[PDB]
Nucleic acid binder design. Structure first.
Lengths: 391, 256, 51
RNA sequence: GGGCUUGAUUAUUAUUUUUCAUCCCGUUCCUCGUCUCGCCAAUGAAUAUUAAAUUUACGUGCAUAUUCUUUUUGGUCUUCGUU
């Protein structure tokens, strides 16, 4: 795929939210200047949102725009690309089955094609997609692989995004895994991971799809074959925080909180803390502190980082979760002090609790005839359970 | 002083014969002082005033390693720096005692002052691949982990050992093994003593329990040895280093 | 492409970990085997015996 | 590259301007030597003996502070004047 280290610094440091002032030496190794459009520019948009703005952004805009009008006029040595750019029909056509290659070569094609950016961005993505499939081409393993990464990056305008989502889980995961002898090393994995995160969770940037929160959870993680070594190396605090947020937002795989807890601790090697506290208290399980934390965290951040978007959902999920645990056993506990906290009059609170119960995650009835929530037994019927098991 | 300039008979510096001069190039001569001082120490157990004498003497011995490295090269490369790394704990627990030592000067070359020393500058400037720190071999890293564990937190030492992949170079090369045991023990002690149970239990239990048999940091000689015979000189030369150990008793309290 | 092992210091990261990574131990010296054996030296040995 | 009135050699009068491969030092460059590491291959198959296909033992008693210093800057003391 891959790369770049200064760019990487710009990336994660901004996400963490401590400051921007950061460089980004560049350009490197997207490319110079080839697709798309630019990586640095996407980072600049995020920076502008964080905190105004600065000299690098201006430079990036200039770079993106030109080289060069003359070059743009010059490009294409024939004989498609047209109706604005591509030949949508052709893109569709190059599978079913077309696979045995007319002429041979798209070597001169690449030379003509390369230009770029402008950004232009939907069209640019479309053109790239068309080039990818020939299929027989020749030229090349690595060049194509770089191309796949570029497609994944941008545009995130949804038809391109859904296509890229399918492509990531078929392509990238396979590529990372060995054989081939021996690729892909730490930098490539980190870079790929960063791009995937950008493409959907919700940085600021942009994220959510339907639904690929799931995709994020699925890849970094899941044990056949494993890594998580890559995630740990060398020191991804922001990523960990984001993962905690993602887990809460999703609200289940099956295993949810437990997996998250294991991931989190990773005690101090690099560990960012506002989301982390909410999850870590909730799973452990203390009920006072957790409840307070969730509003404070919600209000504090935001912060910068708008989208907003998902976080309303996260707040709702978290409240529901804390309460569900609190009920479960425990009592045989009431209900006025629940209502006061979550904050509207008693009936709305009662119906909210009833919705937790109705999911078949608990057996409970609510008395609105004395304002008591009563749990079953069921956790525990002891002898009877054993008789059933045997027979 | 008056030299350089090096005249009458012949002088060089390498290779042929001059010849303590040539070995002082270079500085294999100083290395032989380092070897013999360790020897003296290695036999006599700290008790009577002899121990005081050697400590003062060792503080003296430092100074040459400093100076020499600003006589900078012939590259050389190595020998003086290697001695400094070996000498380092140095010190220490948080560092205490470097300041008291530091105290005559002229001191010079690079790792000086109780701001530093701390290890780290030497480890950094003197690599692990190509040029340096080779021959011998993997390195400064174990001593850096030791330093990090004592004067920082056990997070830093644990992180460095697991990151650097230095757990397959301690299998063969027998000095490095003892170091390996020494740092594992210290990390578990540090974890205990700034105040959690785990990682301290995990590190420390692993070191223990097993083997008996513990010669492995200090002291002590296995069985048996020292009655037999002329083979004593293997477990009394692998290694154990002196003025350290770090306290027996303290480890035992931490483990239990 | 691409790259290949990105951090500070010199050798950067190799393999880590996750911690849980109990690490263990390690002892040595239990069997010997040499081509090109050494001398003795008898000098040292005599001195020891004397002491 | 550093130093060097290095060998030709401005130098040596500060026309000092060098002026180069070079003497003494000099890695990340090419060629050569050697050591380390390595995969495979090389000396261990009795069902009956005519001058012999492989030799003990390998432990005791003794075992250097092994020296002369001239000293000189402090520091514990002492004896005069005087308060």
């Amino acid at each position: 795929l891959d790369k770049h280290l200064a760019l990487g610094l710009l990336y994660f440091y901004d996400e963490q939210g401590l400051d921007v002032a950061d460089a980004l030496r560049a350009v490197q190794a997207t490319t110079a200047l080839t697709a798309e459009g630019e990586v640095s520019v996407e980072q600049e948009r995020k920076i502008k949102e964080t905190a105004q703005r600065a000299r690098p952004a201006l430079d990036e805009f200039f770079e993106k725009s030109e080289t060069e009008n003359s070059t743009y006029q010059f490009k294409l040595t024939g004989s498609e690309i047209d109706a604005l750019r591509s030949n949508r029909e052709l893109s569709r056509d190059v599978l079913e089955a077309k696979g045995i290659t007319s002429n041979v070569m798209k070597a001169v094609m690449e030379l003509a094609y390369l230009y770029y950016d402008a950004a232009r961005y939907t069209d640019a993505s479309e053109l790239l997609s068309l080039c990818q499939c020939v299929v027989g081409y020749e030229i090349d393993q690595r060049t194509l692989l770089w191309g796949k990464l570029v497609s994944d990056m941008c545009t995130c305008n949804w038809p391109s995004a859904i296509a890229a989502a399918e492509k990531i889980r078929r392509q990238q995961n396979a590529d990372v895994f060995e054989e081939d002898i021996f690729r892909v090393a730490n930098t490539t994995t980190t870079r790929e991971r960063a791009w995937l995160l950008h493409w959907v969770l919700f940085p600021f940037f942009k994220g959510g799809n339907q639904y690929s929160t799931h995709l994020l959870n699925f890849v970094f993680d899941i044990k056949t074959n494993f890594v998580y070594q890559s995630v740990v190396e060398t020191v991804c605090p922001h990523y960990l925080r984001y993962i905690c947020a993602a887990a809460i937002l999703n609200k289940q795989r099956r295993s949810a909180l437990r997996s998250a807890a294991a991931m989190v601790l990773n005690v101090y090697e690099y560990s960012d803390p506002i989301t982390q506290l909410v999850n870590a208290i909730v799973n452990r399980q203390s009920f006072e502190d957790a409840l307070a934390l969730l509003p404070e965290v919600k209000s504090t951040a935001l912060g910068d980082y708008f989208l907003i978007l998902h976080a309303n959902e996260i707040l709702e999920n978290a409240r529901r979760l804390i309460f569900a645990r609190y009920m479960m056993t425990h009592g045989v506990v009431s209900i006025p002090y629940v209502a006061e906290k979550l904050g509207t009059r008693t009936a709305d609170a009662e119906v909210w609790l009833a919705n937790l119960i109705s999911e078949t995650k608990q057996r409970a009835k609510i008395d609105s005839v004395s304002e008591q929530m009563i749990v079953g037994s069921q956790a525990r019927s002891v002898h009877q359970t054993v008789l059933d098991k045997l027979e | 002083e008056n030299p350089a300039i090096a005249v009458k008979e012949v002088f060089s510096g390498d290779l042929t014969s001059k010849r303590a001069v040539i070995m002082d190039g270079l500085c294999g001569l100083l290395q032989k002082l380092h070897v013999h001082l360790q020897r003296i120490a290695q036999f006599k157990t700290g008790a009577t005033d002899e121990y005081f004498e050697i400590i003062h003497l060792e503080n003296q011995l430092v100074d040459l390693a400093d100076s020499v490295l600003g006589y900078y090269q012939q590259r050389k490369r190595g020998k003086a720096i290697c001695c400094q790394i070996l000498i380092e704990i140095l010190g220490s627990r948080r560092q205490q005692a470097h300041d008291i030592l530091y105290h005559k000067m002229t001191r010079l070359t690079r790792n000086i002052v109780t701001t530093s020393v701390i290890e780290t500058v030497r480890e950094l400037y003197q690599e692990l691949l190509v040029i340096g720190n080779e021959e011998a071999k993997c390195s400064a890293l174990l001593y850096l982990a030791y330093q990090m564990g004592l004067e920082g937190k056990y997070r830093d030492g644990r992180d460095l050992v697991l990151r650097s992949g230095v757990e397959e170079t301690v299998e063969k090369s027998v000095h490095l093994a003892i170091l390996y045991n020494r740092v594992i023990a210290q990390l578990g002690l540090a974890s205990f003593a700034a105040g959690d149970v785990i990682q301290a239990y995990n590190l420390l239990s692993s070191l223990w329990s097993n083997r008996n048999h513990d010669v492995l940091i200090s002291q002590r000689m296995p069985d048996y040895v020292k009655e037999n015979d002329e083979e004593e000189l293997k477990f009394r030369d692998l290694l154990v280093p002196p003025h350290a150990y770090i306290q027996h008793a303290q480890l035992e309290l931490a483990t239990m | 492409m691409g790259f290949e092992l990105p951090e500070i210091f010199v050798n950067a990261p190799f393999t880590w970990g996750p911690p849980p990574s109990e690490i263990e131990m390690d002892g040595m010296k239990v069997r010997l085997y040499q081509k090109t054996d050494a001398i003795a030296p008898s000098d040292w040995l005599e001195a020891m015996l004397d002491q």
